Amino acid sequence: SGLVPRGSQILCVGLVVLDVISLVDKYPKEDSEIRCLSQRWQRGGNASNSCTILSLLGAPCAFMGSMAPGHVADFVLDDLRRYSVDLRYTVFQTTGSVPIATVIINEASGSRTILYYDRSLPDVSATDFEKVDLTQFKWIHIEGRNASEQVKMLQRIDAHNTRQPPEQKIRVSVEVEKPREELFQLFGYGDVVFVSKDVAKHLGFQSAEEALRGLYGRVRKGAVLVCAWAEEGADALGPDGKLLHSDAFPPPRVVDTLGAGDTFNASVIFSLSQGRSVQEALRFGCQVAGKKCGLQGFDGIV
Amino acid sequence: GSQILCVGLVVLDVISLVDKYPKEDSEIRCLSQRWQRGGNASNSCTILSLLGAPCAFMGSMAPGHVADFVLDDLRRYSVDLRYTVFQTTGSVPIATVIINEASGSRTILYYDRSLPDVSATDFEKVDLTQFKWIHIEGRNASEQVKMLQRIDAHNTRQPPEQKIRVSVEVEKPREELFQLFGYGDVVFVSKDVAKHLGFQSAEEALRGLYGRVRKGAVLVCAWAEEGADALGPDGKLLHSDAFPPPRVVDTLGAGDTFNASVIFSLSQGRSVQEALRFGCQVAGKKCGLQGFDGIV
Amino acid sequence: GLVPRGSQILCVGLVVLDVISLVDKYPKEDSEIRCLSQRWQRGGNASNSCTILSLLGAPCAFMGSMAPGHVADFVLDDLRRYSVDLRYTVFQTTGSVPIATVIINEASGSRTILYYDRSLPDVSATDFEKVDLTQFKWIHIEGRNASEQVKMLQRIDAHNTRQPPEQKIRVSVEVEKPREELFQLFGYGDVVFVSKDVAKHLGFQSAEEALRGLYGRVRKGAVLVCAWAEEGADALGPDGKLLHSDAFPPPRVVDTLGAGDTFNASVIFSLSQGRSVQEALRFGCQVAGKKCGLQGFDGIV
Amino acid sequence: GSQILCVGLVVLDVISLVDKYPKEDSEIRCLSQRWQRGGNASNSCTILSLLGAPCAFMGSMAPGHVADFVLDDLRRYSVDLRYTVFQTTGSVPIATVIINEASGSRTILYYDRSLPDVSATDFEKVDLTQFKWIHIEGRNASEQVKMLQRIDAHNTRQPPEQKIRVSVEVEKPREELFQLFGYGDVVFVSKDVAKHLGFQSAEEALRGLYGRVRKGAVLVCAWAEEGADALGPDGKLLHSDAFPPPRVVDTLGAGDTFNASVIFSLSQGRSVQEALRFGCQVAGKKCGLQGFDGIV
Membrane-spanning regions, if any (chains B, D)? Predict the structure, then answer.
């Protein structure tokens, strides 16, 4: 079958989530009873979905995430296997369970409304990451969660990199998606930093451009800051000071926006990993994300 | 001859408790999440059981995890499983229930999985001598009319003390159920049905629908914070006020609770007036608690 | 549709996961041998009884403890395949389904069982109290937790005091493992099965001796049955007359796992059909003999 | 260049512990039962990890539940997973192991599930600069010869102090494994292979087979309760007696424990005599313990 060659995979570190998805014909009225058009299970979590898209795009990838044995684990693991995502670095846990997101998708508009049920699964630790043999990966993408622990991980990778020739340097990306103050440290790590519109608004920014000019001072020297802003497309700012923008590329009809953000992030990583410019990565990300929005789930993108 | 039979649906309720109703396109954290056996007739068995009346659930099931959960839960409440009917296609339906803990509202996204209904032919095999009361949740009305006629015919051969009392619930607003009004000693009509039919109060609905019941029958309409009313053959409109709890936290199955409490009270020989008061009392208590257990 | 009254045979007892290794020769201690094959098969005396009953065409139900999980999904899936009624499964919040590691020697068809208990709570008398008896014409109880099973047997007897003859429930008990608490069960049921292993453990050299020596312990009117593998089986009832059937050996004996369950279930079937004790004995030997020439159970029919 | 790589099999050991060895056709109750990650190279990493030596497992796995257990366990011992090779056909082999707690004996019913082996093409991708020692469990000899030739060629460009040390285990009496004797710094031959070659002691086996090893190589043969012997280039036969525990409860993986401990000792720069003694000491200790953890 083949040993995985050095420096050949993209690693994504973060959460797996079970999405239990109900499609409805209009957004439910409070205290009413509505009939589901359909209902399905779908693997989710930001880093988990990134691997789906990377895979679909034809990038070898690996997922590192906590896991608990069980029926839900069986489903998300089996799904991860379907997309040939390398799972050697799954971290099994003896307490807690995989979280469940109950997702209401309104077919009127493609909107998605998420009721998140946390089930106490322990996060991947810095001492878990210490065990990872870095020779396997050309790019490591980290979904911000437990900051002080992830900082140690990012520090580990930077230290590896001080010992590597240019062909063997590991590119790093970070996602700051949840509006929690402890994630603010993460801006100062990584070659590419993704900040969400949600965090941007919570941090007092009115636009993507304002967010990027406002937060660029927090990134490490040389970093590219990326902020996606839904129907207003996506922007980026790198060390040259030039604000880059892509318009959104909506499909003719929006039916399912769940994981559109992850589709953007993964598409930007793919494009950059393939040696495209940041400008090109931005447009590709918005194009792939918009195509996804016209489809149920992820498969029809390729 | 001492059991109460409840014929209807069983539903898996997958319940999420939230601090406010979710805005569309937002992500909110659940305070908690639980599985709960539901369905109208199924919930009625739960309350009867808690009140101390031996009961049996008659309804369709399918093999698998969901049915195993609901069967186990039925067992925990000592609900007699003799008349469960295992179907070879379809699956137990699943209600995703959002309970807003700000108000106790329950919003239900219902996912049907094509489970066949129990038929008149299934009902023909039921041993009617086991039951003092049979309650039918309106579902497949042409078949259920045949069940009701079976009970009626049975009752023509019984002395007074051996007569099986019958209640019917019309709880979904589907016209095919109108037929069912014409059977039973007690007929329950839901506020939701009443409102869909154009009615704006319990008394308005009772006066608007009493034409449809058979001679001697009592029509009953519960109206949430407005208590419950009843109208019987003497023409006297009866009412109980509600019994709201200190805070309403969970109104899922409150109407089932009311119906079961009324059946319990009536099956025990109480007046329709006392039956309304007790249904209002128990259902109001239920609304102040998660699930059903704390009612007793 | 709805199961008619008095129509099913209920079997109360254990479900077990059998993990079966087929080997060309019985392994020598401290050696390493290659498995010819390896399979998962649902087992447990009461569980296996239902398989045979379903195969013979008798509507049946299984009541035993179950713990959610993978092993449960395997045995539950397999129970459903034979259309066994599962409404009286007693799911438990502790413990797991036991695993029996079984070595089958292809040279002889012997079965050696390494049994691993996984602390699953047993079906209790309170559990049994909830069973609506109107569904069943025959109840078979695999002896396990005897003081609780005696209450179940007492409940069935009381039920029967209120039934016309068409509605009387017939009862069998199995004493298969040589454990002291079980021997109390000899005194209940219309039909009492005692294994060759138990007989030998109590110091009896033959099916005849075991039946003479144990008959004083059964209740008035009962039939005591003791199968003796390749020597056939015996039965003894109130008339003091020992009945026998010789074994019906297969061309080659390839798998004897569940032969005893096959026997028991086929006797129950034949009796439940109104056959004589002599005929049920014969038929039990006939079906268990056939099973011994086949891997698993499906080939009996 | 500080890790030890162990190339060979992982096997799932499904272990039943009993108080007596089973009589054929009987039924016996297990004292206990457990899964243990096994296989010669896999066990080697467990021991190296416990002794304090950073190591890596190279070997085939198939995605699925069993691999998840194996990877988790490897994770727990901090064994580097980089050179695990995922196969798209076959599955991890399963060894059903009966351990008689009265003697500590282990009887193995092996179920092979057709897992493709690690190839020399896989080995070509290994970063040799990561490792100071490489241990190869003899299996697919023509492929492993190519691996050993690759290591030899790498060593021709290293100075004395950056040379990769190499061990080979010949554990099966298969004629194809004999060519592996000519490779490596340390060659392990089991008591079983030795007896099959007609040797009646470790001393006879060493004398009889030393001619098959390359110039300067050390040949080692463990003889269980009789200890272990070695022979190197000076021609001096070395021996250590066994170190039996108070009682022998579990001898599964005792050969792997010996080999790994010898490798460890030698990797730390100890004499061959000291390494023999240490391997006997650790292996002896293991045999008095269920599994591996209690050795340190």
Answer: none
Sequence-separated (6 or more) residues with CB below 8 Å from residue A114: A101, A102, A103, A104, A258, B26, B27, B28
Q: Quote the DSSP letter at residue B293.
A: G
Tell whether residue A285 is among the known ligand binding residues. Answer: no
Residues paired with residue A38 on neighbouring β-strands, in sequence order: A23
User: D163: closest CA among D172, D177, D152, D147?
Assistant: D152
Half-sphere exposure of D93 (CA within 13 A, CB side): 23
D235 is in an annotated binding site: no
Domain residues for D208? 1-296
Contact B282, B257 (CB under 8 A): yes
Q: What backbone phi and psi angles, to 5 degrees, belong to B52? A: 95, 10
Assess contact for C228 and C196: CB atoms under 8 A: yes
Distance CA A42, CA A56 (A): 16
Q: Rounded to whole angstroms, how far apart are CA atoms B170 and B173?
A: 8
CB C178 within 8 A of CB C204: no
Helices B272-287 and B254-267 meet at what angle, rounded to 10? 150
Rg (CA), chain D: 19
- Distance between CA atoms of A134 and A149, rounded to whole angstroms? 18
Decide: B173 and B209 in contact? Cβ < 8 Å: no
Cα of D135 vs its chain's centroid, Å: 8
Q: Which resolution in angstroms does this entry have?
A: 1.9
Spatial distance between the Cα atoms of A199 and A175, rounded to a whole number of angstroms? 11
Q: What is the DSSP letter of D80?
A: B
- Contact call for residues B255 and B242 (beta carbons, < 8 A): no
A-B contacts (CB, under 8 Å):
78
Phi, psi for residue A197 in degrees, rounded to 5: -60, -40
Residues 6+ apart with CB under 8 A from C98: C14, C16, C17, C115, C116, C117, C118, C120
CATH number for B102: 3.40.1190.20
Domain count for chain A, please give it: 1
Question: How far, in Å, CA of C296 to CA of D7, rounded?
Answer: 40
B127/C134 Cβ within 8 A: yes
Q: Are strands A243-246 and A234-237 parallel, antiparallel or unpaired?
A: antiparallel
**Cβ atoms C213, C270 nearer than 8 A:** no
With beta carbons less than 8 A apart as the criterion, state whether C119 and C130 touch.
no
State the chains in contact with C (3 or more Cβ–Cβ pairs under 8 Å).
B, D
Residue C231 marked as a ligand binder: yes
Instruction: Confirm if B278 and B284 have CB atoms less than 8 A apart.
Output: no
**Type of residue found at D191:** K
Give the number of other CB atoms < 10 A from CB of residue D214. Answer: 12
HSE-CB of A285 using CA atoms within 13 angstroms: 35
B228 annotated among ligand-binding-site residues: no
The answer to whether residues C2 and B125 touch, using CB atoms and an 8 Å cutoff, is: yes
Q: How was this structure determined?
A: X-ray
Compute, in degrees rounded to 10, the torsion defined by CA atoms B145, B146, B151, B154.
Answer: 140
Whether the CB-CB separation of C64 and C12 falls below 8 Å is answered with yes
Helix (H, G, I), strand (E, B) or coil at D14: strand
Asked if A100 and B28 come within 8 Å (Cβ–Cβ), the reply is: no
Residues whose CB is less than 8 angstroms from the CB of residue C71 and which lie 6 or more positions away in sequence, other chains included: C17, C96, C97, C99
Q: Which residues of B97-111 are buried (b: 16+ CB within 10 A; e: fewer)?
A: bbbbbeebbbbbbbb
Q: Do C115 and D29 touch (CB under 8 A)?
A: yes
Q: Cβ separation of B30 and A117 shorter than 8 Å?
A: yes
Chosen for mutation from A27, A36, A118, A256 (greatest number of chain B CBs closer than 10 Å) is A36
- Stretch (H or E) spanning C175: strand C170-175
CA distance D292 to D288: 10
Q: How far apart are CA B133 and CA B149, in angstroms?
A: 15
Provide CB contacts within 8 A for B62, sequence distance 6+: B86, B87, B89, B90, B91, B92, B115
Q: Which phi and psi angles does C298 have, rounded to 5°?
A: -60, -30
